[PDB]
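Notebook, student rotation project (T.W.).
Task set for the rotation: take a protein with a known small-molecule partner, predict the structure of the complex, and write up what can be learned from the model alone. Partner molecule chosen: guanosine-5'-diphosphate. Sequence and SMILES entered below by T.W., checked by me.
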Amino acid sequence: APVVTVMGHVDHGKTSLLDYIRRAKQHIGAYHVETERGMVTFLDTPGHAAFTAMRARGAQATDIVILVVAADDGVMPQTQEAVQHAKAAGVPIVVAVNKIDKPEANPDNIKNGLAALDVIPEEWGGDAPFVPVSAKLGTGVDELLEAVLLQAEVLELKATPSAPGRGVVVESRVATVLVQDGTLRQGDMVLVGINYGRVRAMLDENGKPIKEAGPSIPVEILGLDGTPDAGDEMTVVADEKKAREVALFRQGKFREVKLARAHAGKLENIFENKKTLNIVLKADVRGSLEALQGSLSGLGNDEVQVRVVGGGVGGITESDANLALASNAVLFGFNVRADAGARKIVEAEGLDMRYYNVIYDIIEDVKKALTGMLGSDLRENILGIAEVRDVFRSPKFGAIAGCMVTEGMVHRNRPIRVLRDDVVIFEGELESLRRFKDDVAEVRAGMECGIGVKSYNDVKVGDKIEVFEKVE
Ligand SMILES: Nc1nc2c(ncn2[C@@H]2O[C@H](COP(=O)(O)OP(=O)(O)O)[C@@H](O)[C@H]2O)c(=O)[nH]1
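Predicted structure of the complex:
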């Protein structure tokens, strides 16, 4: 009885397939279906973003993952990101073409498009299965439900019924847990993550009250003193003082491990702490991604092997940061900046995150990291940010844009970058800046000004302008 997570591109059929499967044989976070070949359960929330977030806390609540693609407009970049996320942990991947109920959409380019992703099918090399399904039409459910269990061909031992409570939390709305090992008879003391309580309500997916929990079945518990996190682990204790002592020891241990990760996980400590140095790469364009991947694929043979575990085009989404945290890798943003959630995750944990705007710099830094004598605190710094709120261009010289300066100081003697959607578009120099039509040469923090950049008039609303100095 494995655990299934649905993964795929947006608007491809993940929710539709999950709903059809549930209806064939009240949203809490998980559900289960009984089949003659064997019971199989699914998690309500699909997508790799939620899958890796709980992965990052060592939960490992996945057994088999299924990709859903479409015969039309198939294998989009998010599908590649999802398969990367599934392979980083390491699980068998079962793929399924969903929209095979379209006006002659051929499920043939999908196979040889996904083949060049280490998802080689059976008829090609014999590595992964391919199934035609259709949530709308209904043809293909039986094949998928047989293949999900057929490809689950590991020992699958343990999960002993008579065992102490051991499960993982899913959704802390009252909460829900999908227990891995043991039984969850109500009334006994329970330690759910950093939390203590007693089992008073033990509702099921359909709301029918029960008292016993299956080996790999979900259950919604209610009665705890509050709300734990979404990736913690739950067990059974006996003494409330024991639970409190365990909670305080967990505070101490987490506070120690955060500093240990922020220390050893930096790029500067690669040689000291093989080890198969992992990196997570983000680039502004596909060419600068492929070139960097080809350069970083081979670097050092006898000592340390560098393998890229990510690779995407756009800003540093919090899913990318969660993947890097789970894989304990090093961020690498080439001409791309992080978002708010990525900034939050990087601030919380260690997450060595360094930016670059030159291809050679990344190879140089990685070579020194493998060598072990790299220099620290180099390659410029950020000294000011402004947000563009209005762009006006008179028909005599149109380059001025109104900007609100946020958390920094913008000046005239330093080069600038202009970026949209956390992606840079131009890196030149500052031509003019003025307040109240007065040509001031220094704008403080929190102020408002009018900025015009030389030899570039394309600024729009909601941009960002960063000012930096090459300091060595
Ligand atoms: N023709 C056809 N349309 C489908 C099929 N499956 C899903 N759809 C449509 O595609 C959309 C899928 O959206 P959905 O998967 O729920 O969004 P997501 O959860 O963000 O991926 C739905 O609005 C359906 O109407 C199918 O097998 N055939």
